[PDB]
Amino acid sequence: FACKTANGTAIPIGGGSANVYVNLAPVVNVGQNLVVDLSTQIFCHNDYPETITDYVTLQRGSAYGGVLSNFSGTVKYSGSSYPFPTTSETPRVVYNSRTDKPWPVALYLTPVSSAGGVAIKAGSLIAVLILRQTNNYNSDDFQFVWNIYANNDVVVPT
Numbered sequence: 047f048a049c050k051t052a053n054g055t056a057i058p059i060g061g062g063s064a065n066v067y068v069n070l071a072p073v074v075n076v077g078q079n080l081v082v083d084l085s086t087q088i089f090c091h092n093d094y095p096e097t098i099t100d101y102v103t104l105q106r107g108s109a110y111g112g113v114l115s116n117f118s119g120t121v122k123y124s125g126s127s128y129p130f131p132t133t134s135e136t137p138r139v140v141y142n143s144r145t146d147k148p149w150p151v152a153l154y155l156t157p158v159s160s161a162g163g164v165a166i167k168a169g170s171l172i173a174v175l176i177l178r179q180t181n182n183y184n185s186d187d188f189q190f191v192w193n194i195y196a197n198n199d200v201v202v203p204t
């Protein structure tokens with residue numbers, strides 16, 4: 047089991063960490079959701095599906111920078127929504143193919159407070175998402191740590 051980002055940055059067998067630079071909607075109005083859809087950015091595959099079923103959870107989702115201070119969030123994991131920052135670990139998603147498949151994570155972030163300025167600064171760390179990969183074969187328990195950075199400013203008009 048291994049993963050890569052849309053631009054080809056890889057985390058090999060055994061886990062590790064990688065940075066993900068995501069485009070954000072430049073404007074998020076009060077009462078609207080800022081969607082950070084990682085399913086277009088993070089992809090994983092099973093290296094021996096003939097015998098092994100890979101299990102993948104969101105082990106931890108943490109907020110940083112502007113998202114931590116001024117946004118309220120949920121994370122959608124494989125069609126179900128959970129609080130963001132995370133309190134529990136999600137149900138497992140299954141990977142059983144050598145062809146890359148999306149990691150189905152998206153953040154839904156709604157502004158709490160804003161003065162009209164830049165709520166999220168371009169280049170800042172907005173989230174750390176830890177993917178935990180286990181299987182039905184051995185006791186492997188590997189962490190794939192995704193450091194989510196904003197590519198652009200996000201403004202919340204007021």
Ligand SMILES: N#Cc1c(F)c(F)c(-c2ccc(O[C@H]3O[C@H](CO)[C@@H](O)[C@H](O)[C@@H]3O)c(Cl)c2)c(F)c1F
Pocket residue numbers: 047048059060091092093094095097098099100180181183184186188
């Ligand atoms: N014949 C044969 C044969 C073989 F060629 C293989 F490569 C393996 C095999 C390949 C990948 C393996 O592990 C990695 O890929 C797993 C599935 O993605 C993942 O769950 C693990 O954590 C880790 O990332 C493990 Cl353990 C074994 C195997 F079991 C075999 F029996």
